[PDB]
UniProtKB/Swiss-Prot annotation, chain A:
It is found in: Nucleus; Nucleus speckle. This is Pre-mRNA-processing-splicing factor 8. Widely expressed. The gene is PRPF8. Plays a role in pre-mRNA splicing as core component of precatalytic, catalytic and postcatalytic spliceosomal complexes, both of the predominant U2-type spliceosome and the minor U12-type spliceosome. Functions as a scaffold that mediates the ordered assembly of spliceosomal proteins and snRNAs. Required for the assembly of the U4/U6-U5 tri-snRNP complex, a building block of the spliceosome. Functions as a scaffold that positions spliceosomal U2, U5 and U6 snRNAs at splice sites on pre-mRNA substrates, so that splicing can occur. Interacts with both the 5' and the 3' splice site. It is linked to Retinitis pigmentosa 13: A retinal dystrophy belonging to the group of pigmentary retinopathies. Retinitis pigmentosa is characterized by retinal pigment deposits visible on fundus examination and primary loss of rod photoreceptor cells followed by secondary loss of cone photoreceptors. Patients typically have night vision blindness and loss of midperipheral visual field. As their condition progresses, they lose their far peripheral visual field and eventually central vision as well. The MPN (JAB/Mov34) domain mediates interaction with TSSC4 and SNRNP200. Has structural similarity with deubiquitinating enzymes, but lacks the residues that would bind the catalytic metal ion. Contains a region with structural similarity to reverse transcriptase, presenting the classical thumb, fingers and palm architecture, but lacks enzyme activity, since the essential metal-binding residues are not conserved.
Curated annotation (Swiss-Prot), chain B:
It is linked to Mandibulofacial dysostosis with microcephaly: A rare syndrome characterized by progressive microcephaly, midface and malar hypoplasia, micrognathia, microtia, dysplastic ears, preauricular skin tags, significant developmental delay, and speech delay. Many patients have major sequelae, including choanal atresia that results in respiratory difficulties, conductive hearing loss, and cleft palate. The lineage of its organism: Eukaryota, Metazoa, Chordata, Craniata, Vertebrata. Belongs to the TRAFAC class translation factor GTPase superfamily. Classic translation factor GTPase family. EF-G/EF-2 subfamily. Transmembrane segments: none annotated. GTP binds at residues 15-18. Coiled coil: none annotated. Disulfide bonds: none annotated. Component of the U5 snRNP and the U4/U6-U5 tri-snRNP complex, a building block of the spliceosome. The U4/U6-U5 tri-snRNP complex is composed of the U4, U6 and U5 snRNAs and at least PRPF3, PRPF4, PRPF6, PRPF8, PRPF31, SNRNP200, TXNL4A, SNRNP40, DDX23, CD2BP2, PPIH, SNU13, EFTUD2, SART1 and USP39. Component of the pre-catalytic, catalytic and post-catalytic spliceosome complexes. Component of the minor spliceosome, which splices U12-type introns. Within this complex, interacts with CRIPT. Interacts with ERBB4 and PRPF8. Interacts with PIH1D1. Required for pre-mRNA splicing as component of the spliceosome, including pre-catalytic, catalytic and post-catalytic spliceosomal complexes. Component of the U5 snRNP and the U4/U6-U5 tri-snRNP complex, a building block of the spliceosome. As a component of the minor spliceosome, involved in the splicing of U12-type introns in pre-mRNAs. This is 116 kDa U5 small nuclear ribonucleoprotein component.
Swiss-Prot record, chain C:
Component of the pre-catalytic spliceosome B and the catalytic spliceosome C complexes. Component of the minor spliceosome, which splices U12-type introns. Interacts with EIF4A3 and PRPF19 in an RNA-independent manner. Direct interaction with EIF4A3 is mediated by the MIF4G domain. Full interaction with EIF4A3 occurs only when EIF4A3 is not part of the EJC and prevents EIF4A3 binding to RNA. Required for pre-mRNA splicing as component of the spliceosome. As a component of the minor spliceosome, involved in the splicing of U12-type introns in pre-mRNAs. Promotes exon-junction complex (EJC) assembly. Hinders EIF4A3 from non-specifically binding RNA and escorts it to the splicing machinery to promote EJC assembly on mature mRNAs. Through its role in EJC assembly, required for nonsense-mediated mRNA decay. Changing residue 183 to A: Decreased EIF4A3-binding. It comes from the Eukaryota. Changing residue 186 to A: Decreased EIF4A3-binding. This is Pre-mRNA-splicing factor CWC22 homolog. Belongs to the CWC22 family. It is found in: Nucleus; Nucleus speckle. Residues 15-198 form the MIF4G domain.
Amino acid sequence: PNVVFIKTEDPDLPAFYFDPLINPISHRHSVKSQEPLPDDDEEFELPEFVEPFLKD
Amino acid sequence: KHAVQERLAVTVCINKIDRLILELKLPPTDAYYKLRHIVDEVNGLISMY
Amino acid sequence: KNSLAYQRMSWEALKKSINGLINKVNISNISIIIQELLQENIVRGRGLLSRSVLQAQSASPIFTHVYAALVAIINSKFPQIGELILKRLILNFRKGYRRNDKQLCLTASKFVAHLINQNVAHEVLCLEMLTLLLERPTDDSVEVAIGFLKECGLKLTQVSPRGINAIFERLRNILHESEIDKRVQYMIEVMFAVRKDGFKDHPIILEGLDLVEEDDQFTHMLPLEDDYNPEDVLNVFKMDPNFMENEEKYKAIKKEILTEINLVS
């Protein structure tokens, strides 16, 4: 499976940084989808001790 | 196509996810874009069959 | 009297000839037609000069670049002229859009894209135009931003690739997480087509639409929602008590401005 690991030009722009080299995703389809979407306004709520796993 | 024409259960495991991170160097939003894309393509195709 | 009849004949014959040269200006006649628009005092009728330029860039999707080359010639020299034209095309673009006139919006947006590629229009107003085009993209405004970008995806990406990446993210999300149809789907596909093609189908300015030098130009920034004005009532003439004074002055401004051995072996 061909490996595609893209050389950077400078150190500057971030580690993850969409470069022109990758082809622009632009995924297209029909009316994309809908889900068994559990709307809020019934209820759900996060006990605020669990902020995002390593946002720090 | 073969699994549809023989009516089995339909499971999908997207694998090899480091190939988006270390190999691809894709920021997370467009990472999600590609993931959603694989999902929508395979789903539309199952809708085809 | 005599001076009155003279100012009236001036306005009449002058405006008619300047509009002739407006519709006549060519690329093999770019500098020639611009120097004829100078041989006539185009600033004496600066309003109807902006008006002839606007009329060309609006009613001609294919001579917007030519009206633009004239605008760049006269705008690196008299920036206020292309400036009135710019405020005008902003008025016409917000006219078409905020009144839901696809054709008017497209005309004025092609004019503004020509200005941005000529470097008489600044990138923040182009950004605001793209952003107010893609805010709630349906078929019309999606095609409006994409049509602007068909010619002006180069200049924005070359002076600030930030705008190109932002446009790609916004277009991709607004068309890839939202309910749009084959129109905006294939429109995003076309946008990505130009992008990946490297703006090779539509560079900044074809031969002869940019010859003015690096810093000898004028990119004045008058934005979209800034309460600008047309100042186009100057398309109707006006009596002149300082006609002779300002005439000598502006004519002085236009004068100051111009073996068999291979065989054998």
